[PDB]
Design a binder for this molecule. Sequence first.
Ligand SMILES: CCCCCCCCCCCCCCCCCC(=O)O[C@@H](COC(=O)CCCCCCCCCCCCCCC)COP(=O)(O)OC[C@H](O)CO
Lengths: 331, 94, 120, 173, 26, 57, 55, 63, 99, 459, 64
Amino acid sequence: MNPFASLTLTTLIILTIPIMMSNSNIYKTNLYPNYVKTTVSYAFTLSLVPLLMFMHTGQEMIISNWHWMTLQTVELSLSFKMDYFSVMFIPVALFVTWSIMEFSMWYMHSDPFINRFFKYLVLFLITMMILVTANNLFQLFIGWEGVGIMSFLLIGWWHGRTDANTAALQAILYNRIGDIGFVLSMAWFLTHSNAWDLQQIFMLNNECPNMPLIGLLLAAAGKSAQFGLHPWLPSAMEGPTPVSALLHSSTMVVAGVFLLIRFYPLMETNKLVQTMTLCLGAITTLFTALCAITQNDIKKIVAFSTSSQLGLMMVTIGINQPHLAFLHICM
Amino acid sequence: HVTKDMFPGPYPKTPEERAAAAKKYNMRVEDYEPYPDDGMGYGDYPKLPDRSQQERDPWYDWDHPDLRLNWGEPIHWDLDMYIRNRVDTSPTPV
Amino acid sequence: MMSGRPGRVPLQFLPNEARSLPPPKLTDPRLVYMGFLGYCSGLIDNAIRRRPVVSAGLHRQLLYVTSFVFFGYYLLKRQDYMYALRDHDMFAYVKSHPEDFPEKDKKTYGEILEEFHPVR
Amino acid sequence: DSWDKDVYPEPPRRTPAPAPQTSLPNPVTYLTKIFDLLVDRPVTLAREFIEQQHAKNRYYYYHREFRRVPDITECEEKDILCMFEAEMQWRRDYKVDQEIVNIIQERLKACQQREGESYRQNCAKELEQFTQVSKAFQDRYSDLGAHYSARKCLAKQKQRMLAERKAAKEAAA
Amino acid sequence: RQWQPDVEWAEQFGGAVMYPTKETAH
Amino acid sequence: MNVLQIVRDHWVHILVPVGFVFGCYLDRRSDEKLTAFRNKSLLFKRELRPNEEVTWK
Amino acid sequence: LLDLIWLETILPKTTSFIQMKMSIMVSNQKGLIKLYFLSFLITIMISMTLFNYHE
Amino acid sequence: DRRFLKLMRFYILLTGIPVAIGITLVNVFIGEAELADIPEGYVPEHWEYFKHPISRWIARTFY
Amino acid sequence: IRLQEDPDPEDENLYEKNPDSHGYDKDPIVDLWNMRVVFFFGFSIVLVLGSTFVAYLPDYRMQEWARREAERLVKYREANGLPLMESNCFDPNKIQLPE
Amino acid sequence: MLKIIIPTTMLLPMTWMSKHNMIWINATVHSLLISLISLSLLNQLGENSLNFSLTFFSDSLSAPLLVLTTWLLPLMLMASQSHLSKETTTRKKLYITMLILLQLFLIMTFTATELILFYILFEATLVPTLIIITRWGNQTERLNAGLYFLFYTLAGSLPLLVALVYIQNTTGSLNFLIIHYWSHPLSNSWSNIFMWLACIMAFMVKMPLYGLHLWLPKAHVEAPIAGSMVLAAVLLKLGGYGMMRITTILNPLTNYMAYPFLMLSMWGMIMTSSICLRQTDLKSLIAYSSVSHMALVIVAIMIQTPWSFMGATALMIAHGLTSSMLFCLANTNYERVHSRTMILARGLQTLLPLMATWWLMASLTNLALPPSINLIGELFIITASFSWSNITIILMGMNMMITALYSLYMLITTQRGKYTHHINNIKASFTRENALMALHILPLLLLTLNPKMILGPLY
Amino acid sequence: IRWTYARSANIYPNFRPTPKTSLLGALFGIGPLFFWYYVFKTDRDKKEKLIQEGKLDQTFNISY
Ligand SMILES: CCCCCCCCCCCCCCCCCC(=O)O[C@@H](COC(=O)CCCCCCCCCCCCCCC)COP(=O)(O)OC[C@H](O)CO
């Protein structure tokens, strides 16, 4: 019984403690942001250990656990996957949000609702780790819709800003259009491959997933703010800077390409769709960068770099380069 | 509160109805103009200029600053496209 | 339908041979419904006359319940009689015309085809 | 143990004996030692304390068995008295047959993760066994309608041998 | 308070013929 | 506490649980009318336990 | 257009309008015995002869 | 707002914890059931075909 | 006058009479108890206590039984050396094929 | 079932015999007690309905709806404790009597073992619902709305009555069990298709698909809060409950005639949700939303697929709880501001902070996001529909896009923005309202843990 | 209230069934409904056309 599965599955349970602790209201309303930072710091320290036995051995453990329900021949169960992509991404995501937390109590130190804001960040945190760490496509949807809804509230953090609500509404709109491909991917995979677990989809060897991969690409494009579905990210600057420094920069919007990295065992089989990835990645890189340099707003310029960088990632995943794609994600 | 005649009714044809309609919508006859009688059921509701609330000058004291509508001004029939959150007919520089 | 049967002396609410049936028990659910309707009449009567419906005279309501319970029980016997009569003469007829109701032979579902229609 | 080694077959788990030729120690071994001395031992102490407590009263529970009953193909037609037994017989086997796919489906998942990047050739037995099961499962219960019934299942079945027997005769002739 | 019928509502159900017409005008 | 006042008022509270007891009694009354095939279906037909005289009530 | 202009004028209002016109003259007779009994005369004549109910 | 939130959190725990300990208590005082071979001569009872004693007790006194 | 009516009443805010009003009745004693009963027989007695009821309900649809019976069936079928599951359900030995 | 009906009917005199003030107290206490007893029905045996007697029976489809109805019963009482208030005692006593009678009919209907016995109680709910709509309705057009309601559903229900009595004459008993076991394949003759039309139109009126759905904007908007929840959370599903029950005797005639209603509904949910995208009345917006979600079921069951039915029940229970919730939210806003226009009371989160979170969770559930029941309901329909036709996802997928926009539209327009200046009567939220809504939202969150209870009879 | 009333019920009393209204009602009404029917009926027909002779592959499609 290697500890690998044990503490790496804890890594989620420490993160969700501040959420429960908040509604208890026992916390003294001044040190709550400091309390949130410490918990994330402890999670990063804890999540470091799953790395050490990874490079030491490389073991990847599936944590298939409590059986939600068994629909005839579909055993929908909560399950987290400890592949290299998952185990690598936890420390860096925690490390970044830890830095954003430290930046947050300095910058966001005047809003009376600062305690509420920190709760949303932890809420955004846990809904992202269940997206990266998952084994069934349904669980991906929980993280997929969770970050989108969490983004909408966090964009609408300043509430009364009529433009910010429009950006908040616009963010959900482009996200859902991408999610149309996500639901299409689920329906195809549950009809033909007869499951949503990643293991079965890879095993059954769907060598011609033209409709799935197109749906998968559409899910990636909507979330990764690619061309044709980009302008929400440039307009997503209305939220507070720490919000845009964590969600819309390096942790949320990167989830779109993570889906393709998850499903790279099927990406190489269909040559047409991987050209479509190269097709979508190339145009996105130019247009966002081309609009970037003619801007007079610091937040807009930096964000356009992310999308142009984000468009680069799908160029990487195009020609059978998933590991390098995820390498670029971490940096 | 509001009495029956103030509620919008039939299409105005004689100038007596147009004059009363202008009174009904707290506007003048010179600028009053109902929607074309194409059977869509607009009735005597005036056709105000198709310009979003974004066009309205924010600096002027608006009683509803979130919508830039003061009071009793004829609400545009297609208001909720032109509300600040929704569709905006802002004059593009090009 | 009944009306015109042999031995059908008219204006009779309960012919003698009808008594060869199990009389309804006083706790019959049909019978207790008769009592419930009678009680509801008592409430309406006081409501009609603008009286304290709940307890506006225990004499008027008592007659209402008893009368409905009475008329129900006699109606139940005639109810039970005719239905027994309706099924009775059928069995005499069904044995009186054997050729009209021939027993179709029995073949298990291992033989009968049902041309299963797929759903898509 | 709680499960079966044959129903859930596992290849022999063989692990190497790591030899850190480098002078500097591997932290994982240090973290392994502290993990046992910090989490594993207190968990074991509490568990075994519960285990002996559980042994203080060994209340029992059996598994219900339904003896086989005549099926709809032997059921007298329009005879509801035996038809209810046959329908319960078919539906109960449907759930049991559904679990048969689930067991084989789960075994397919286990090989794919366990065999790693060499999953494609390490086990095709799981794939073909699932292929044979799923194909024959399609023959039995697939496309039976929302209100599936033993009568429909027999009707779909009867439609099957009619076609293949007809296909058999034309080939032979 | 909830809406209650006024005199005009009563006049609806108040004619000699409930749905007036030219033939029943008088 | 003026027990007379509370019984005059809270006589309604006891009423519904009585109806529930009424319902349970009728549920175990209508069942015996539907006994018929008791220990007859071959799926559950089984030789009676010695002391008691009846299977499922 | 569809919901509260046509979908209410196809089934609901048209049937209401159809029931309106029919109820217009069914309820509006003239109260003259001459017209009534004359309508009886056709009814009896047409009943025996031309619906052929006697056959 | 605070009185309402204080009310739910305080009161939803009124039968919250007693159930919470009670559910755990029967788990680690009574124990878990175990499989069998249906010993001969013992026709089991309907509630006996269940693992958790809380589940068995429900089937004993309700169903 | 048109009609001799009364002016439309005003929305009686329950708090100006008693500050701790619970939005149940104007009388403090009743509404406070109203809050007591709607809560007690609400979240705890029905929602929380009833939760454990449905949570600890006996095996739904005999789900546990289904797999338990299944495991034995595989054990003979796997060991005997025959296909795990036949393509047909009602085996055609006792079937009367038409024509 | 007499463990539930008998207390319910006997509960009615108790309300009539309670003291002047304790009427709400005693009625709410025992109505919840009835809900607790009804929760015992959630145990469904393996592959057989829980047949209690000849008259009544239950299965893995009626039980989730029954417990929802009984659990709903206290909620109309709570939501009506304020707008009623200033009325004579007897009228309030009558109001409770109508509700209890209405709930009593529903319990008997869902457990009816005879399709005829179903038919009586299925429309017997019309008499109390019409009474509530027209008597205590707080608007003028309730009279025409009430007329639109009963005539629409009765015009559908009358051809039904002729249909079942015909089936009775052809196959004797109409018992739900015997219909399934003794089912025979309906032909394609022009006589059977009209039987198919009659057997479906009555159920699909209270379903309403696109087209004959115009009592939904009328019945819900100008109805008392108690009536709006009841007639949007239960009897809409009551019309649906017949379809799964009655489709047992309509095969294989469904497939040939499935298209006209499938195409009307499937294009409908886009059209209806498009109407939802821009509405002036909040209650109307929620009302049209119910049509879109209900249209998801109509295509669902009438595809006639295992996965389709399993998701159909899940969406039904989830939507009823959500639609019942949002109607409370509109009523709470309407009671304070005495208007229904959405843009009239913009900026409410600033003044009422809790009401925003309730409105956030209400709209969030309407978003059909995972893992809530609404998502696990819609998703199963998508999978069943996609297998039926690969091009379904273009339509029904686009719905989630349109559904998201309007379902968040009221969130932006009412909660966020700016508090309306001239309105100054919005008092702090009464603990009744907040307690009522928690009884709506978090039980949904529980049901996420164990969907198999409401997943339907095909699980 | 005037704005809400104009959008609300007070549209049909001012409605007149001109051929413009009639054409638009049919165009955006029965139009799309029939159009989708042809698309889906064709899609269902071709799909079932492949199934009946044994062309389509659904070897692992069991839960539908
Ligand atoms: C406002 C309009 C109604 C709204 C939509 C409602 C649904 C539309 C269809 C309504 C159907 C009503 C009649 C269905 C009753 C049951 C019919 C049945 O079971 O099928 C019979 C089908 O038989 C019929 O003829 C059914 C009626 C067909 C339609 C004609 C009457 C209905 C339409 C007109 C009246 C209703 C419209 C309102 C008019 C004011 C089978 O009998 P058979 O014909 O095989 O009988 C043996 C032999 O062949 C000769 O009988």
